[PDB]
Amino acid sequence: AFEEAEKNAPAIIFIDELDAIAPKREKTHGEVERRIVSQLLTLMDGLKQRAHVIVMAATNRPNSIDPALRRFGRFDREVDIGIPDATGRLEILQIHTKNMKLADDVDLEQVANETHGHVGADLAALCSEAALQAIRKKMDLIDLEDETIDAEVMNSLAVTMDDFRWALSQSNPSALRETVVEVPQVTWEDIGGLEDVKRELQELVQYPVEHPDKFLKFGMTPSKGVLFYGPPGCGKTLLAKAIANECQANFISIKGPELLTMWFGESEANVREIFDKARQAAPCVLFFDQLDSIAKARGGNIGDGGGAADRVINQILTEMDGMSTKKNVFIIGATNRPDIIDPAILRPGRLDQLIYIPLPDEKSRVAILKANLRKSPVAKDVDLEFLAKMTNGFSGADLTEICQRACKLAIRESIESEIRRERERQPVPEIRRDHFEEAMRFARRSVSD
Amino acid sequence: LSTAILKQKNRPNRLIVDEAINEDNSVVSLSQPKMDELQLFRGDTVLLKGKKRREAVCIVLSDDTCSDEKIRMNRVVRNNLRVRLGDVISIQPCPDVKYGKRIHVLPIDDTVEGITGNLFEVYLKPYFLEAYRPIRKGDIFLVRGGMRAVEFKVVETDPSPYCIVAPDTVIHCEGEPIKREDEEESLNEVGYDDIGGCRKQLAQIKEMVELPLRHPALFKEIGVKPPRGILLYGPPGTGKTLIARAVANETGAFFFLINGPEIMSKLAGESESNLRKAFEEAEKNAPAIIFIDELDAIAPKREKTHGEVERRIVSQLLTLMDGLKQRAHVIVMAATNRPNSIDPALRRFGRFDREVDIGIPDATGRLEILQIHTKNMKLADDVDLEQVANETHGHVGADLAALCSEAALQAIRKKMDLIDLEDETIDAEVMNSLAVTMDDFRWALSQSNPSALRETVVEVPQVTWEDIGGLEDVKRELQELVQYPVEHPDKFLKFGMTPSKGVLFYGPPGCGKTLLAKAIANECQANFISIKGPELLTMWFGESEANVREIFDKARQAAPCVLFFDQLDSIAKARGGNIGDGGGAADRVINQILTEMDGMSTKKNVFIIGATNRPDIIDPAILRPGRLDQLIYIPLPDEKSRVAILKANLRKSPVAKDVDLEFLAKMTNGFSGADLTEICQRACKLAIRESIESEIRRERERQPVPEIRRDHFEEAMRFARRSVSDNDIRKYEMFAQTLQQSRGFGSFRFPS
Amino acid sequence: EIGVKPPRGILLYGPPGTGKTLIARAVANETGAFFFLINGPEIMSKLAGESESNLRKAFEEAEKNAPAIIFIDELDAIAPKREKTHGEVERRIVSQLLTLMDGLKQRAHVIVMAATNRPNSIDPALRRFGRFDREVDIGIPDATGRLEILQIHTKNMKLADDVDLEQVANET
Ligand SMILES: Nc1ncnc2c1ncn2[C@@H]1O[C@H](COP(=O)(O)OP(=O)(O)OP(=O)(O)O)[C@@H](O)[C@H]1O
Ligand SMILES: Nc1ncnc2c1ncn2[C@@H]1O[C@H](COP(=O)(O)OP(=O)(O)OP(=O)(O)O)[C@@H](O)[C@H]1O
Ligand SMILES: Nc1ncnc2c1ncn2[C@@H]1O[C@H](COP(=O)(O)OP(=O)(O)OP(=O)(O)O)[C@@H](O)[C@H]1O
Ligand SMILES: Nc1ncnc2c1ncn2[C@@H]1O[C@H](COP(=O)(O)OP(=O)(O)OP(=O)(O)O)[C@@H](O)[C@H]1O
Ligand SMILES: [Mg+2]
Ligand SMILES: [Mg+2]
Ligand SMILES: [Mg+2]
Ligand SMILES: [Mg+2]
DSSP: OHHHHHHSSSEEEEEESHHHHOOOTTTOOOHHHHHHHHHHHHHHHHHHHOSSEEEEEEOSOTTTSOTTTTSTTSSOOOOOOOOOOHHHHHHHHHHHTTSSOBOSSOOHHHHHHHOSSOOSHHHHHHHHHHHHHHHHHTTTTSOTTOSOOOHHHHHHOOBOHHHHHHHHHHOOOTGGGSSOOOOOOOOTTTSOSOHHHHHHHHHHHHHHHHOHHHHHHHTOOOOOEEEEEOSTTSSHHHHHHHHHHHSSSEEEEEOSTTSOOSSTTHHHHHHHHHHHHHHTTOSEEEEESSGGGTOOOTTHHHHSSOOHHHHHHHHHHHHHHHSOSSSOEEEEEEESOGGGSOGGGGSTTSSOEEEEOOOOOHHHHHHHHHHHTTTSOBOTTOOHHHHHHHOSSOOHHHHHHHHHHHHHHHHHHHHHHHHHHHHHHOOOSSBOHHHHHHHHHTOOOSSOO | OOGGGTOOTTOSSOEEEEEOSSOOTTEEEEOHHHHHHHTOOTTOEEEEEOSTTOEEEEEEEEOSSSOTTEEEEOHHHHHHHTOOTTOEEOEEEOTTOOOOSEEEEEEBHHHHTTOOSOHIIIIIHHHTTTOOOEEOTTEEEEEOOSSSOEEEEEEEEESSSOEEOOTTSEEEOOSOOBOHHHHHHHHSOOOTTTOOSOHHHHHHHHHHHHHHHHOHHHHHHHTOOOOOEEEEEOSTTSSHHHHHHHHHHTOSSEEEEEEGGGGOOSSTTHHHHHHHHHHHHHHHTSSEEEEEESHHHHOOOTTTOOOHHHHHHHHHHHHHHSSSSOOSSEEEEEEESOGGGSOTTTTSTTTSOEEEEOOOOOHHHHHHHHHHHHTTSOBOSSOOHHHHHHHOOSOOSHHHHHHHHHHHHHHHHTTTTTOOSSSSSOOHHHHHHOOBOHHHHHHHHHHOOOSTTSSSOOOOOOOOTTTSOSOHHHHHHHHHHHHHHHHOHHHHHHHTOOOOOEEEEEOSTTSSHHHHHHHHHHHSSSEEEEEOGGGSOOSSTTHHHHHHHHHHHHHHHTOSEEEEESSHHHHSOOTTOOSOHHHHHHHHHHHHHHHHHSSSSOOOSEEEEEEESOTTSSOTTTTSTTSSOEEEEOOOOOHHHHHHHHHHHTSSSOBOTTOOHHHHHHHOOSOOHHHHHHHHHHHHHHHHHHHHHHHHHHHHHHOOOSSBOHHHHHHHHHHOOOSSOHHHHHHHHHHHHHHHHHHOOSOOOOOO | OOOSOOOOEEEEEOSTTSSHHHHHHHHHHHSSSEEEEEETTTSOOSSTTTHHHHHHHHHHHHHHSSSEEEEEESHHHHOOOTTTOOOHHHHHHHHHHHHHHSSSSOOSSEEEEEEESOGGGSOTTTTSTTTSOEEEEOOOOOHHHHHHHHHHHHTTSOOOTTOOHHHHHHHO
16 A cells, blocks of 8 residues: 555555554554554654655544554644534535525524534534425325325425424434433423522523633633532432523433443543543533542542542543633532532532532422422412421422322322212312322421431 | 324325125226226226235226225235235236236145146146236236145246236246245235334334335435434344344345344454445445344444454444445444444444334334234134233233233143144144134233343232231322322323322331232232342442342333332441441442432333331431332231231131130230231141141041131230330331421411 | 244253253154254354354254254353453354344244253343243252152162152152
C-alpha cells in the first residue's frame, strides 16, 4: 500500500478504523499484531522522507491508539471533530434538505434549536423518520398491496412541520441510546411547593447554555454540581424526573451500584465511559441516584474487602476535575444519608451547590394535595386545608398514599355495588369525605423526628 | 398511521375465498354483479394473488350462489395459493396469456405408491386432453382415478410462468417424484399472519422491508434513503427468529442468513473474509436482506473484548455497514437477546438505525397468539381461548406453544387404553375420536410455567385460604391488592391513580406471615418469586447488586408478579452500621433495592411483599410509602382467632366430638398459632403411640384408636408452652404504638 | 393427526448417581434411531472456530440420518450462562448451540437429550421451550424404588436363600 502511494504522487493514504490495525503494543498478546504496529511506526518514519504522500487516519477511540503513534513526527497534527453547535446543526439541516420536498411552513432554525446532542447522523435519522411519517399520512389513499400509485398522491408528497415535530418527539442521540430509561411523564406543576428549588434548577440548567457571555463578562465560572439531601419521600427523584421530561438538556439517569464489576479495572472503565458519553452529548445532566452507594467515607473499603470502592471514587473525582468549564455537563446527586458521603466530593469545585429538600410545610402540603388530585374527580365538599392542618409531619409520599388509599376505598365500593347489581340481575362518581377519613385513619408518618 | 400499512382498507378487488361446489381444479366462479364491476367476461383467464408469493391462474366462471364479496374456489387452488377459507385475495386478468408449448409435471411420491398403471396414461393423458386449463409453476392439482388419486405438480411451464394446456402440448411424467415431506414443508411456511401480538412492531418491520421494495418511487419522490438496518431485541421466546422466517418466506428480495458463531474460522483473517464474502454476495443480487442471528455473539464491545480476532471482526462489520463505499440497496437485520452487549458504534444511524423491541405480549396479544396456534390444531366445542389467554400471565409465545403441545400430549395420553405401542398401526375410529378438549387445556395450565421463571421456581406446600385461621381483614386486603390492578385497571384509570404495590408483614414469630405468603403463592392470579434473604449475596465485588437487579428484572418480565422476601431484615438493614461487610457490600445492596423499588424507571405491575421478625432494624428508606406502602402487623391471635386456628388445623384430622375447642382456645392465652399447631401435633403423636402399643399387644396375643380423644389433648396440653414472651410482645406493641402516635389521631373527622 | 409437533428436547437433572447416563444408554439401545454421543468437554479445542465446527458437524451428522437422538452428557460444562462467562469461546459455543437447536432452519426429526447435575448453570435461553422442551427430574429412589433397583442388580449374581432384599432396602 505504501509503495503504491509512493509510485503515484502526490497521494493520500486513508486508514479507516486505525485502532483496529494499531492497538497498544503492551496490551497486544499476538506476535503478528505487534509486528504490524511496529511496521506502521516504521512506515511513518519512512513517510517522513517521502515528499508528496500524506497519511490521514480516522478512529472512534483516540485513546486506544498506541501512544507512540501519537508522538511527534508520526501523526503530528490531530483534529478533534467535535459535536456541532446550534449553527452547525442548522447548516447540516440545510445541506441535507436541499433535495427533499420541504413545504413552505417548515423553518430549519427551530429544528436546529430543538436538538441538543445530535452529531449529524442523528439529524439524518430525523429527516428520514419525518419523510417516513409523511409517507404514512398518504397510506390511507394508497395501499402497499397496490402495484401502482396515482400521480396526484405523488404530487401530494411533501414534508410539513408536523412531520419534523413527530420526528423530534421520536428522536434521540445515538450516544444516549446505550443508556435510556422510560421516565414517567412528570411536569413542574405536578410537584407541589419547592418553588424556590424549581426556579434555582431552571436557572442553573438554562443560564450557562443560554447566556455564557454574562458569566465570562463577570469572570465567574458557573457551578456544575448540585447535591440533593433530605428526608425520604420529599421529592429529589421527582425533581430529577421533572428535569428529564421538561428541561431541554440531555439526561443520563443511573443507579448507584450499577457501575461496579468484579473484574479488575472494569468499574473505573465504566465510570470513564459514562462521563465520556456525558461529554459527547453536552448540554447533558448526569444524575446520580443514591449517591451514598458510590461515594462513601474513604479507607473503609481498603480496611475490609477488595478496596475497589476507593479507586472508583478516586476515578470519579478525577473525571469531575477533568471536564472543562466551557463544556455543559451538570452533575446532580441525590441522597437521603448525606452524612456518609465522602467530603472530597463536596469540596469546592465539585458538587458546589447543596440544596436541602425540606419536609413540606402547610402551604407545601396544600400544593401537594392539589397536585395529586388534579386528574381525579373529587367532591367539592372535600377540604384540603384541613388535611394539610392535621398532617403536621407528613412527607409528600405519605400524602400521596393517603390519596391512594382513598382511591382504593372508592374502587372497592364501586366493585361491591357492581356485584350487588349483577347478583340481583341474575354509584361513586367521585371520592367522598368518607374515603379520605378512612384513609387518614390508616395514615402514619414515614419520617421520625 | 403506524398501523396503516397493516390495514387492507377494504379494496374492492380482494374477495372472500369460498368453497366451490362444482368448480374443477383450474376454474373459479364469481357472482354476476362482481364481474359487472370487474368487467370480467365468462371463460376469461385471470391471475389470482396469494400468500407467501404464491400465484395461480384459473378460468373465471359465473355462479349464482357465489356472493358479491366472495369467490368460490376448489381446494386445489387454495393449496396452490396457500390460502385458507375466508382469506381475501385480489383477482386480475392475466395479461398476454399464451398457450403452453410444453409442460412438465411430476407426481407426488406417496400417491405413485401402489399405482400399477402408468401415471401419464391413467391420469395425465385423459385429464390434459382438450382440458384448456391454465396452470402456473408450483401448482398441485388432484387427479381422480385408480386405486388412489394421484396429485400432479407442474414443475416447469413453457412459456414461464403462464401457459395453457393444449392437446398438442407435450405431457410427460418423467423425473423423480415430488416428495410428500417437501410439499408439506412448502405448505407450512410462516407469513406475516403467523406472527401474533406486536402489531406495531410488525408494521414497522413491514415499513422497513416491504415498502421500499414495493414502491421505491415514493422514496425517490420524497428524496430520502429508507432505513437499511433493523435490530430486533427482546427476551427469549418472543418471536424475533419467527419474524425473520416470515420475512425470508414472503419477500421478493434475496435473503442471506448469517448465524453468529458460524463466521469464525481457524485461519487468520478468514472470519473477516467470510463476512466480506457474505456482503459481496448480497450486493451481487442487488435488493437483498441479510439476517445476522445471534448478533451479540460476533459484535461485542471493542473496549471489553480482549481478543484481537474478535475486535478485528467487529471493526470489519463496522466498515462493511458504513464506509467509503456505501451499501447498494441491501437491508441488514439482526436479532439479539442482549442489546446492550452490542458495540455502540453499530447502534448508530448509519448501521443499525431502527431498533424494534419485541416485547412480552399483553392478554389480548397472547389470545391472538393462541388463535394463530390453534387454528391448525383439532379443537372441541368446549375449548374457550379467552380463559386460557387470561390465565397465562407472563407467557411470551414460546410458552404458549409449550402449553398447546402439553394439552395435545395429554389428549393423546387419554387414549392409551385403546392405542398400543406394540401394534404397528392405530384404528381410524380412535383418530376421529381424538381431539383436544378443555380439560386437556386445564391440565396444561396446571403444569404450565413461564420459561423466564424456570430458575426461580420452588415447590410450595399447597396452602389454601381456608387453612389460615383468623386474619380475615388481612386476607381480604391481600386479595384486593393482587386482584384490583389486574382485573380492574379501568377503574384506576377513571380515578386516575396508580395502585400501591408494597406490603410488609411484621409480628411475633409463628403468627402467620409465611403462611399468608404460601396462600398467595398457591391461589392468587399472579406469578410468584420467593427469595430467602441472604440468598442474593455473593463474595465477588459488585455481584450482589447484579443478583438483585437480575431478580427485579425477572419480576418485571413476568408481570403481574409477586416478589416475596422471607426475611427482609437480613438484606435491608440500616445503612452505615457495618464495620466489615466487605467494602460496604450490604449498604450497596440496600441502595440497589432502594433504587429498584422506587427510582427513575416507570412503575410496572410488580408487588413486593416482605416479612420480618424485627422491623426496627430495617432501613427507614425501605419503609417509605412507594416502597412497601402498607405495613401490616400480624399480632398474636385472640380468642376467636384461636378457635379458628384450632378448627383449621383439625379439619382433616378425625377428632372426637367430646373435644371442646372453645375451652382450649380460652385456656391458651398468648399462644401463637405455631403453639396451637404443636398442641394438635402432640395429641396426634400420643394417639399414634397408643395405636402402636395396641397393635403390639394384639401381635403378642396372637403368637383401637379410631379418632383422637380428650385424654390425648390433656397430655398434649400439659406438655404445652408459650413460645413468645411478654418482652417480645411489648417491643412489637412499641413499634405499633410509635406508628399510631405518628398518625396523630386515632380518628379523623372533617368539619361540618 | 392431532396437529402439533412432538416434543424434541429433554433435560435430565438430578444428584450424581441417580441413573441419568443409564437412562441414556437404555434409550440408545432400545430405540431404532441413530444415536450420537457428545461429551461436554470433548467438543472444545484451542483453535478459534473449531469447537463450533465440532458442534456443527455433530448436528449435521444427526440431520443426515433420521430419526436421530443426540445426547450431550455434562451439558453444564459446555453451556454456561453468557452473562457470567468472560471468555469469548464459551459464549460463542453457547450461541452456536442455541442456533443449532432452534434457528431459522429447524431440525425436522432430531431429538436432543442432555444430562446435567446442576440445571441452573444452563443458559436461560436453552431452557426455553424450543430448545429443551421439558426437564425430567431423576430423583433419589424411595424405599420401594431402591428395592426394585436391588432386585434388578441382584438377578445376575448368585444369591443364597437367606438373603432378604426387603430388609436390605429398608436399611439403606
Ligand atoms: N412535593 C411533592 N409533590 C408531589 N408529589 C410528591 C411530592 N413529594 C413526594 N411526592 C410523591 O412521593 C413520591 C416522590 O418520592 P421521591 O422518589 O421523589 O423521593 P426521594 O426524595 O428520592 O426519596 P427516597 O430517599 O425515598 O429515594 C412520588 O410518588 C410522588 O408522587
Ligand atoms: N408472535 C408469535 N406468534 C406465534 N408463535 C410465536 C410468536 N412468537 C414466538 N412464537 C413461537 O415461538 C417459537 C419461535 O421463537 P423464536 O425462535 O422466534 O425466539 P427468539 O426470540 O429467537 O428466541 P431466542 O432468544 O432463544 O433466540 C415458535 O415455536 C413459534 O411458534
Ligand atoms: N393463623 C394461623 N392459622 C393457621 N395456622 C397458623 C396460623 N398462624 C400460624 N400457623 C401455623 O404456624 C406454622 C407456620 O408459621 P408461619 O410460617 O406463619 O410463621 P412466621 O410468622 O413466618 O414466623 P417466623 O418468624 O418463624 O418466620 C404452621 O404450622 C401454621 O399452621
Ligand atoms: N435406577 C437405577 N437402576 C439400576 N441401576 C442403577 C440405577 N441408577 C443407577 N444405577 C447404577 O449406577 C450406575 C451409575 O449410574 P450413572 O452412570 O447413570 O450415573 P449418573 O447419574 O449419570 O452420574 P453422573 O453424575 O456421573 O452423570 C449405573 O451404571 C448402574 O449400574
Ligand atoms: Mg430517590
Ligand atoms: Mg432466535
Ligand atoms: Mg417465616
Ligand atoms: Mg453421566
